[PDB]
């Protein structure tokens, strides 16, 4: 199933995400959630750290993992974990073991392997692949998602993680592979702002086969693939 | 906000709707639902009458109304209520008082007025207009919804209901007006099958002001407007 949601504002998108985080936490069983970094996740973290979310969300039932992470120390300005910690985790009461950071300070190939083994060990699996309850994703102006970049992504990668490099900066990242995104119950591309209007129009109107964009090609095989836009991102299609 | 959902099968569409019907019923308070007739509602009624829905849905909390009704006796083949009753109501335990049919056997104008007063009396209002929790809508091959037909719909009608005549047969209907649809918390256009692919593509790609279709023009003002499609109806856009 595919679900496209167009909200009037970025704030409305983030509220809807926060409401879902709360609902997940009330279910009772562990919920494994994969986090992206960037401007929309930043907004989400700030709302989640505020009342009444900070108090009402049952953080003990939620597990945070990362769809990708920059290979820098967790206190570096470019750490996804570091930003989530600064805006959210340091402001709430959540079991430390429910936060599953990628070790960006470590040798990346061995870290990708440790990260993959942790996912497979902790998260319920289907055919050996961890099944996320929810993966939050970005879409770059180049169509990338997590750190799966156009022209670098092996869609038949059987591993659960990969070391990839940013195509412009050469920065190393540890990323989930497409396989893990495809295995998830629900993945949600959070695509906000005028800056994304053009790529939205391309993905919306063009067969995925004709595009080089990982975000256009990767969907949950048997679950839900969602596109969250605000009116600015949707301005060319709605 | 606008929500588009594309499901792989008609069964999956109606499953999603029945799950929502269940959840609505579990809030220990009245939920006002407006029903359309036609193939998809038909499928929904059969599912609602099956296990586990027949027994688990708290029918005492749901109130059913009609977005439109054919001005025929309730046991006539052409009655929307009559079909809902044959497929669902006669198979479940639901208070008679919770089923608010349009009296299709009666003089249509005085019936439109009775229907209007009945909605205004018991459904919480906003600026005088009853606010439906959920309105299920069809979209005809001509773009009509409820019994609001292209070229014959007064989008500025301040009344809550209207007598309409089918443009082909002259058959009389009592319909909600556009105003009631626009005031609802949630309206959901249920558009299934290859027969709808062409008009799905037209509504999808053309500004509503350039289209004569009521279903292209009518949305919830401050709530959710949804389009539920199957792969077949989405074939020209996805």
The best one-word shape of chain A is: globular
Q: Approximately what portion of the residues of chain A adopt beta-strand conformation?
A: 15-25%
Total domains of chain A: 1
Q: How far apart are the termini of chain A?
A: 21 Å
Q: Could you spell the SSE succession of chain A in H and E letters? A: EHEHHEEHHEEEEEHEHHE
Percent of residues in helices of chain A: 25-40%
Main sheet makeup of chain A: 6 strands, parallel
The radius of gyration computed from the alpha-carbon positions of chain A, rounded to a whole number of angstroms, is 17 Å
Task: Name the chain pair whose interface involves the most residues.
Answer: A-B, 10 and 10 residues
CATH structural fold name of chain A: Rossmann fold
Name the CATH class of chain A: Alpha Beta
Structural class, from helix and strand content of chain A?
Answer: alpha/beta
- Total count of helical runs of at least 4 residues of chain A: 8
Name the assembly state.
homodimer
Q: What is the strand tally of chain A?
A: 11
Describe this structure in words.
The PDB classes it as structural genomics, unknown function. The structure is a homodimer of 238-residue chains. In chain A, helix 1 packs across helix 2. The first copy, chain A, has 238 residues and is α/β, with parallel strands linked by helices. The two termini of chain A are 21 Å apart. Chain A is built from 8 helices and 11 strands. In chain A, strand 8 and strand 9 form a beta hairpin. In chain A, strands 1-11-10-7-2-3 form a 6-stranded parallel β-sheet, covered by helices on one side. In chain A, strands 4-9-8 form a 3-stranded antiparallel β-sheet. Chain A has a two-stranded antiparallel ribbon with strand order 5-6. The first copy, chain A, has a single domain, classed as Rossmann fold, CATH 3.40.50. Helices cover 30% and strands 21% of the residues of chain A. At the A-B interface, strand 1 of A face strand 1 of B. Strand 1 of chain A pairs antiparallel with strand 1 of chain B, so a sheet runs across the interface.
């Amino acid at each position: 199933m595919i679900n496209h949601k167009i909200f009037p504002t970025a704030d409305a998108v983030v509220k809807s995400l926060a409401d879902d985080m709360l609902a997940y936490s009330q279910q009772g069983q562990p919920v494994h959630i994969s986090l992206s970094g960037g401007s929309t996740p930043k907004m989400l973290f700030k709302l989640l750290a505020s009342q009444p979310y900070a108090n009402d969300i049952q953080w003990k039932n939620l597990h945070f993992w990362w769809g990708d992470e920059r290979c820098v120390a967790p206190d570096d300005a470019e750490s996804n974990y570091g930003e989530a910690n600064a805006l959210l985790f340091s402001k709430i009461n959540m079991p430390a073991q429910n936060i599953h950071r990628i070790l960006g300070e470590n040798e990346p190939q061995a870290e990708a392997e440790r990260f993959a083994q942790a996912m497979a060990h902790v998260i319920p699996t289907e055919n050996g692949t961890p099944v996320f309850d929810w993966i939050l994703l970005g879409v770059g102006a180049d169509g990338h998602t997590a750190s799966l970049f156009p022209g670098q992504t092996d869609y038949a990668d059987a591993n659960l993680s990969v070391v990839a490099s940013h195509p412009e900066s050469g920065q190393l990242r540890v990323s989930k592979t497409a396989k893990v995104l495809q295995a998830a119950k629900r993945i949600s591309y959070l695509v906000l702002g005028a800056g994304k209007a053009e790529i939205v129009e391309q993905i919306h109107t063009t067969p995925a086969e004709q595009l080089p964009y990982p975000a256009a090609k990767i969907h949950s095989t048997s679950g839900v693939t969602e596109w969250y836009l605000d009116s600015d991102a949707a301005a060319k299609i709605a």
